[PDB]
Amino acid sequence: EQLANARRDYEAEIARARQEAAKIVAQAQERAKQQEAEIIAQARREAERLKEEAR
Amino acid sequence: GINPTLFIAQLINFLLLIFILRALLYRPVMNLLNERTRRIEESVRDAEKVR
Numbered sequence: 789e790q791l792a793n794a795r796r797d798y799e800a801e802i803a804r805a806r807q808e809a810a811k812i813v814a815q816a817q818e819r820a821k822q823q824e825a826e827i828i829a830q831a832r833r834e835a836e837r838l839k840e841e842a843r
Numbered sequence: 844g845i846n847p848t849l850f851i852a853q854l855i856n857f858l859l860l861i862f863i864l865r866a867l868l869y870r871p872v873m874n875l876l877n878e879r880t881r882r883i884e885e886s887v888r889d890a891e892k893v894r
Contacts (some may be wrong), residue, residue, distance in 0.1 A: 790892045791889075791891065794891070794892035
């Protein structure tokens with residue numbers, strides 16, 4: 789049974805690796821949108837700060 | 844003195860009885876050999892599974 793399970797574990801590792809790769813891309817896209825929005829929000833405050841300094 | 848007919852008669856029955864036991868001995872030898880082969884295969888398969 790261990791020998792049969794070893795083949796199943798080998799297939800499971802490939803399946804888990806593919807799932808993690810898809811999750812990594814999904815996590816990256818979600819993180820990038822939040823990271824870009826957070827940086828834009830800070831820069832928007834700087835834009836108002838730059839405008840206030842200019843005025 | 845001992846009559847050889849009596850000695851041969853007992854030996855003949857013993858030889859036939861030993862012949863029957865020889866078939867029984869062959870079967871136990873095969874069963875012991877099969878157990879060794881199964882145990883050896885289990886150890887070999889166990890190493891491959893871990894790797």
